[PDB]
Ligand binder design. Structure first.
Ligand SMILES: O=C(O)c1cccc(NCc2cccnc2)c1
Lengths: 300, 237
């Protein structure tokens, strides 16, 4: 198990670690989070008590370095930093653990939720969507735009998701206009899977990362991407059976984890109704259809 | 965006534009079978593609053979329309290609947009005008060429005959839409009005009779009366 220590907590803030969250008071003796499960990416996220504007946070993997958080009073936020001195880091952590100044990552043993939401998400792929090569961790916030959003503005601070556009020459072969528009299989299997993503695991990784940025930061562009990647599969007549079964599992756990009160701002009625009741795959997502109908029957 | 009464004069400016009406592309008769089921029989149709400034009509005849062995014909017909409009644009010299294509039915928007992806600078627009272009098959010479066709064919017409020698394209379009609305509302009475007087004929190279300016005013009044008369009959007014 790994640890992300905090130098201090000078401003009152709600801190998220993956799907968990807790409140820290202004100048409270909080010095970080311990017992973080090795083997998964993680996200540590923030919403200031005195200014709920800008949720922001950092994706990281404790296997890649020793990371800590320190508040910057000039830029007004909690920053992740890497500590290269290993013996210094271990000594700091040990002192904070001995004084019980850290919260424990509150994982229930039976509980596979985080694995189920990040099964295909890898830190190396995050660092290509979020481009800041001098750090091993990746900053995301509520306002960051996507490359597609920008084409329709600072490119250095953008989310480089794979652009999906159903009315684009990339999606539609000359001479196959009706075929390719009504059946997205070409665009899914040849252009996206074989051409861009290389395999379904990378595609699902990006879909899962988009959902998590939408949920944890309220990132509008992340939400558009997550819906787009679902619709592309659902709107294809020819999808490998293993991908449909995996998608059903991915979506089931996403819909299960979504805060009920954010359902209005995280689920798009036109896209879900199409995928569940009209698309080629309307009958291929049994677990997702069942949870959607029991948890959000209004949206449908 | 959409084309309506507010921006109506835009139809007669110097930016090349075409209306595309697909109503008459897929045409059927419905009938009982020997076993007492119901079956359709397609008949030849047409795409109505019109430049409202010049009167140039590109009438693509849709021969029934294009439906042979195809499924979901009402859907296919929209995509075939878009394919053929796209082919027409590509066939025109650059300086004759439209800057806007206005579809009379919103269901044509996505098919045409997808077929025209290679022309990102041609705007594809709907309209809030209710245009009576379905009644084109009430113009005898157009109906004749469509029904006689034995293969796909494109025939070119000027739907304003020689009117633009005497009137503006705003007035010509208004005359056309009034004639077509009257033919749509009561075809027999409309044709009676247009042909009642044997001394006024249709030139070999025209679609409509050779009315003088004063006679066109009489005809237009009689067409408006027909439309109002039918409205009264319909709604018991
Ligand atoms: O516009 C909405 O009703 C809505 C509702 C819930 C979530 C989102 N996210 C962005 C989004 C996703 C898909 C399509 N358009 C937008 C939008």
């Amino acid at each position: 198990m790994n640890t992300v220590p905090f130098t201090s907590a000078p401003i009152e803030v709600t801190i998220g670690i993956d799907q968990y969250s807790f409140n820290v008071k202004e100048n409270q003796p909080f010095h970080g989070i311990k017992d973080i499960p090795i083997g998964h990416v993680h996200v540590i996220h923030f919403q200031h008590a005195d200014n709920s504007s800008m949720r922001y946070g950092y994706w990281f993997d404790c296997r890649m370095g020793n990371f800590y958080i320190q508040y910057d009073p000039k830029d007004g936020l909690y920053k992740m930093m890497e500590e290269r001195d290993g013996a210094k880091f271990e000594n700091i952590v040990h002192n904070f653990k001995e004084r019980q100044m850290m919260v424990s990552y509150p994982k229930i043993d039976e509980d596979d939720t985080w694995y189920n939401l990040t099964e295909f998400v890898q830190m190396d792929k995050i660092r290509k969507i979020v481009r800041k090569d001098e750090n091993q961790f990746s900053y995301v916030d509520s306002s960051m735009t996507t490359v597609q959003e920008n084409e329709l503005s600072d490119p250095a601070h953008s989310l480089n998701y794979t652009v999906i556009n159903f009315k684009s020459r990339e999606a539609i072969r000359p001479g196959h206009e009706m075929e390719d528009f009504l059946d997205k299989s070409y665009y899914l299997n040849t252009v996206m899977l074989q051409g861009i993503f290389k395999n379904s695991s990378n595609y699902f990784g990006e879909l899962q990362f988009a959902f998590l940025n939408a949920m944890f930061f309220g990132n509008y562009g992340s939400s558009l991407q997550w819906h787009a990647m679902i619709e592309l599969i659902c709107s294809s007549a020819t999808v490998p059976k293993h991908m449909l079964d995996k998608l059903d599992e991915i979506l089931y756990y996403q819909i299960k984890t979504l805060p009920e009160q954010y359902s209005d701002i995280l689920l798009n009625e036109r896209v879900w109704n199409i995928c569940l009741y009209s698309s080629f795959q309307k009958n291929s997502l049994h677990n997702t259809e069942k949870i959607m109908e029991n948890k959000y029957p209004e949206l449908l | 965006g959409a084309m309506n009464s507010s921006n109506y004069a835009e139809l007669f400016n110097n930016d090349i534009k075409l209306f595309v009406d697909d109503t008459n592309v897929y045409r059927v008769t419905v009938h009982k079978t020997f076993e007492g089921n119901v079956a359709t029989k397609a008949i030849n149709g047409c795409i109505f593609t019109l430049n409202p400034k010049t009167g140039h009509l590109f009438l693509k005849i849709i021969h029934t053979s294009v439906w042979a062995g195809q499924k979901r014909l009402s859907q296919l017909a929209k995509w075939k329309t878009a394919e053929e409009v796209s082919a027409l644009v590509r066939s025109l010299p650059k300086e004759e290609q439209p800057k806007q294509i206005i579809v009379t039915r919103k269901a044509m928007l996505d098919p045409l947009e997808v077929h025209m992806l290679d022309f990102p600078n041609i705007a594809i627009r709907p309209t809030e005008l209710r245009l009576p272009f379905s009644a084109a098959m009430s113009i005898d010479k157009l109906s004749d060429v469509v029904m006689k066709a034995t293969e796909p064919q494109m025939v070119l017409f000027n739907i304003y005959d020689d009117w633009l020698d005497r009137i503006s394209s705003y007035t010509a379009f208004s005359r056309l839409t009034l004639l077509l609305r009257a033919l749509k509302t009561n075809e027999e009475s409309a044709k009676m009005i247009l042909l009642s007087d044997p001394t006024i004929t249709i030139k070999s190279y025209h679609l409509w009779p050779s009315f003088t300016d004063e006679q066109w005013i009489t005809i237009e009044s009689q067409m408006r009366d027909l439309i109002l008369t039918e409205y009264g009959r319909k709604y018991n007014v």
